[PDB]
Amino acid sequence: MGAQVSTQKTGAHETIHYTNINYYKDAASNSANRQDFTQDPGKFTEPVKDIMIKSMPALN
């Protein structure tokens, strides 16, 4: 079978995997991508050319 084996949402400090097989032929029919955690807050915060140093006065 074409099984995927990923990691379950566990804790980060306290003392495991789950299997998935896609049965249907269309990708619209899969389960949600509940575990895609990439980020980019810079589109909305600091959306400026001339990057600001956060130590420099930011003007003059």
Binding site: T7, Q8, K9, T10, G11, A12, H13, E14, I16, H17
Partner: protein, 252 residues
């Protein structure tokens, strides 16, 4: 022999000398929640002895014409010491269970009980336009009794035993984790339920995770001069129980 079985959880032990076997519900043992499967972010509580221990509910009297009894089991344990307290102070809680049903008799009594653990045994009202109460579906440690005939009461369950309150065939209840107490063979049954839900944890007040049903299929029979009193005891040990979302206590 394999008729002897001891189960030790916490400071509690149960011995049985007429064990049938142990049913592990779907071949799965209770487990703690992992990181790949959790969703709630704070650190859980794991008392693990204070709560993971056998609690004995009030007995029921097997009579010659009893239809059967049930318990809603996340409920029904809310006065059981620290398990109940941790249910009260947390918003989320999670546990598997060891259910042990004890019913001894003599070699001259005859009877057969089905002991089922039904997940999400949602029940229906006696008025087919009405809805049930919480008191209709559960009474804590007290057992809810099935009926031998169709019940007529608003806000109560349709508790005629042949439909199991669920609108199904009673004889099909063996699809769930079940055992049989055959008096000529048994005096105890034990099911090990893991945590079953569509979510990793839930509120242990709002959602009845499973119902334990005890239904006599073959009636309790004995010839005269024998003991007329046959009780049935249920002993429930939470297992791998953890809780999240601590705040002030719910006041039912």
């Amino acid at each position: 022999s394999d008729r002897v079985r001891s189960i030790t959880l916490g400071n509690s032990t149960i011995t049985t000398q007429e064990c049938a076997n142990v049913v592990v519900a779907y071949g799965r043992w209770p487990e703690y929640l992992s990181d790949k499967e959790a969703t709630a972010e704070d650190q859980p509580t794991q008392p693990d002895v204070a709560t993971c221990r056998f609690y004995t509910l009030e007995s029921v009297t097997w009579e010659k014409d009893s239809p059967g009894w049930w318990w809603k089991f996340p409920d029904a344990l809310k006065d059981m010491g620290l398990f109940g307290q941790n249910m009260y102070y947390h918003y989320l809680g999670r546990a598997g269970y060891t259910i042990h049903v004890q019913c001894n008799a003599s070699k001259f009594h005859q009877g057969c009980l089905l002991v089922v653990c039904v997940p999400e045994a949602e029940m229906g009202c006696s008025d087919v336009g009405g809805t049930v109460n919480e008191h209709a579906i559960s009474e804590g440690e007290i057992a809810k009794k099935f009926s031998a005939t169709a019940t007529n009461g608003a806000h109560t369950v349709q508790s005629i035993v042949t439909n199991a309150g669920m609108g199904v065939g009673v004889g099909n209840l063996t699809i769930y984790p079940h055992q049989w107490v055959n008096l000529r063979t048994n005096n105890s049954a034990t099911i090990v339920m893991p945590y079953i839900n569509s979510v990793p944890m839930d509120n242990m007040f709002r959602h009845h995770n499973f119902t334990l049903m005890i239904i006599p299929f073959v009636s309790l029979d004995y010839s005269s001069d024998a003991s007329t009193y046959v009780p049935i005891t249920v002993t429930v040990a939470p297992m791998c129980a953890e809780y999240n979302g601590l705040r002030l206590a719910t006041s039912l």
